[PDB]
Amino acid sequence: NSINACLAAADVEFHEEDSEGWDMDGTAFNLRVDYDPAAIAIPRSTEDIAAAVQCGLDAGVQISAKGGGHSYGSYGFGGEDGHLMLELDRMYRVSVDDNNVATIQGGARLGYTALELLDQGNRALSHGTAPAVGVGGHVLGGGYGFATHTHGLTLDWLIGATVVLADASIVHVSETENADLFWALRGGGGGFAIVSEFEFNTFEAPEIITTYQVTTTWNRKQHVAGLKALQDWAQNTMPRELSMRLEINANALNWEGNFFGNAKDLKKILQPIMKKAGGKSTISKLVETDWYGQINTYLYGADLNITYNYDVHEYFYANSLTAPRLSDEAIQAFVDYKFDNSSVRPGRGWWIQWDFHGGKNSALAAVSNDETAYAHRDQLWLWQFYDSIYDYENNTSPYPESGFEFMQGFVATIEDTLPEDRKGKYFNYADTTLTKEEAQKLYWRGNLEKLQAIKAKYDPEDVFGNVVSVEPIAY
Ligand SMILES: *Cc1cc2c(cc1C)nc1c(=O)[nH]c(=O)nc-1n2C[C@H](O)[C@H](O)[C@H](O)COP(=O)(O)OP(=O)(O)OC[C@H]1O[C@@H](n2cnc3c(N)ncnc32)[C@H](O)[C@@H]1O
Ligand SMILES: *[C@@H]1O[C@H](CO)[C@@H](O[C@@H]2O[C@H](CO)[C@@H](O[C@@H]3O[C@H](CO)[C@@H](O)[C@H](O)[C@H]3NC(C)=O)[C@H](O)[C@H]2NC(C)=O)[C@H](O)[C@H]1NC(C)=O
Ligand SMILES: *[C@@H]1O[C@H](CO)[C@@H](O)[C@H](O)[C@H]1NC(C)=O
Ligand SMILES: [Zn+2]
């Protein structure tokens, strides 16, 4: 291997293609989109990353940084075969200084990070629920979770980073240094630079968090009336201190989330909306706990402390959508689709998450679409669509040939009713069926032009590009 020879000469560890190491790190989380990298480097330092980049340049291949490997399109591989992969999960050091600023290496995962922040000063950060998700991909695309309505996206806490550029140079980025690249890293997704270290501000772990679940027993009509009510409430009422998402599947619709406060105050907040939503619902979960407690409430069987021994996989097709307030027609269309178009074969299953993303009191929406590369600050809603194949080891049908039409149709029920400029998707919940041109518009909407200009400046040759990433286009 020409690249492996170069890596060896630079004293950078790499995986031989016919090795157990390769079979582990070279196999994508989503087996439906598993790719074969040209090579896999395992940097242990910023200098290692720079040396690895130089090797990829010499080889003439695109280079893809892999953080936690949880992207639905396997972008840690470049979203296709043939890229030099930089497996960063051996670089996960977390260090909190005297100013409560946390320096997190680019290969750190959410669980390990949360544990370290708690151990080093009882600190916390706003991020997703899954412990295996890499901090790198998470923050570059946003970073959404049960703390977003109260504390914003993970990227809203980023204040700096040490990165390696497409020409292998090493520089520091912040609001006062290479600020244009700093802006792009906060929401621009992949392809701008390889981050060796992220620098985050943090908040003290809250004294109390009350987790909850509301279970509904709604028919078709009650789904529409309930969602319409929830929409008005999300837009104008839902408190800054409260987060909520609806777990939707073929036979249920439940509300769940965290409250930065006690159960007494939470019941008084939920009571009014449960009534306005048409009743036919009840609180099925209500527990006061702490930061560590809430984190451990949404692991879904995953190990909390994960670093470089990771070999978990699934076989699925996901999709997403962001949107403003919806018309009754849109909601009706979505509900009808659930009731009449969601039948799947045994061994296959689906679920949807309806996230209370924006809204009057959402900390996320308190930030301008111009302040960071994140371009959905004006969107009330965020959705995650998930189509799973449970018995993929025996049967993947309709995949890989088809099956996409199911969730694409589910998205369309709502998207078709939206003005073109308000149609969007969330890069962290990627839709692999998208072309590079379609993806850029949906994922970055109004900030696409600025991002393409920044991309042209820092990576004109598109060395770090993936199949749907921001293209380099000078202004
Ligand atoms: C699998 C999964 C994903 C997920 C989740 C739960 C599971 C089980 N829960 C999420 C949640 O609650 N909220 C949210 O916003 N996202 C959630 N996700 C979605 C998605 O997987 C993550 O948000 C994130 O994008 C994954 O990051 P990860 O780091 O694991 O991904 P990757 O495939 O290796 O790379 C993703 C992309 O960004 C780049 N990247 C990653 N690290 C770096 C560094 N250090 N420097 C530069 N670029 C980096 C990749 O190159 C690629 O473009
Ligand atoms: C989550 O899992 C991690 C392993 O995947 C654990 O990380 C280990 O933390 C140990 C300290 O808590 C480290 O021990 C240190 O090792 C160095 C050299 O290896 C010694 O010089 C230090 O003396 C020693 N620390 C002590 C006891 O003074 C391990 O090196 C480290 N392992 C790895 C591979 O990172 C996390 O601890 C674990 N999280 C928790 C605490 O639950
Ligand atoms: C959904 O199912 C109905 C029948 O229940 C069918 O007529 C329709 O074509 C399917 N897809 C659409 C357009 O929603
Ligand atoms: Zn190969």
Swiss-Prot record:
Disulfide bonding pattern of the chain: C6-C55
Residues of the FAD-binding PCMH-type domain: 33-205
Cofactor note: Binds 1 FAD per subunit in a bicovalent manner.
Keywords: Disulfide bond, FAD, Flavoprotein, Glycoprotein, Metal-binding, Nucleotide-binding, Oxidoreductase, Secreted, Signal, Zinc
Modification after translation (UniProt): The FAD cofactor is bound via a bicovalent 6-S-cysteinyl, 8alpha-N1-histidyl FAD linkage.
GO cellular component: extracellular region
Subcellular location: Secreted
PROSITE patterns in alphabetical order: FAD_PCMH, OX2_COVAL_FAD
Record EC number: 1.1.3.-
Broad class of where this protein is predominantly found: secreted
Gene: gluO
Glycosylation: residue positions: N305, N341, N394
Entry-linked InterPro entries: BBE, FAD-bd_PCMH, FAD-bd_PCMH-like_sf, FAD-bd_PCMH_sub1, FAD-bd_PCMH_sub2, FAD-linked_Oxidoreductase, Oxid_FAD_bind_N, Oxy_OxRdtase_FAD_BS
Protein name stated in the entry: Glucooligosaccharide oxidase
Catalytic residues of the enzyme: Y429 (proton acceptor)
Temperature dependence: Optimum temperature is 50 degrees Celsius.
Residues given in the record as substrate binding sites: Y72, T129, R245, Q353, Q384, Y429
Recorded superkingdom: Eukaryota
Biological role: Catalyzes the selective oxidation of C1 hydroxyl moieties on mono- and disaccharides with concomitant reduction of molecular oxygen to hydrogen peroxide. This results in the formation of the corresponding lactones, which typically undergo spontaneous hydrolysis. Glucooligosaccharide oxidase is able to oxidize the monosaccharide D-glucose as well as the disaccharides maltose, cellobiose, and lactose.
Covalent link 6-(S-cysteinyl)-8alpha-(pros-histidyl)-FAD (His-Cys), residues: H70-A130
Cofactor(s) listed: FAD
Source organism (scientific name): Sarocladium strictum
Entry's Gene Ontology molecular function annotations: FAD binding; metal ion binding; oxidoreductase activity
pH dependence, entry free text: Optimum pH is 10. Stable from pH 5 to pH 11.
Reaction catalyzed: beta-lactose + O2 = lactobiono-1,5-lactone + H2O2; D-cellobiose + O2 = D-cellobiono-1,5-lactone + H2O2; D-cellotriose + O2 = D-cellotriono-1,5-lactone + H2O2; D-cellotetraose + O2 = D-cellotetraono-1,5-lactone + H2O2
Mutagenesis or variant effect for H70 to A/S/C/Y: Does not abolish the covalent FAD linkage and has little effect on the Km, but significantly reduced kcat values 50- to 600-fold. Abolishes FAD binding
Protein family (similarity comment): Belongs to the oxygen-dependent FAD-linked oxidoreductase family.
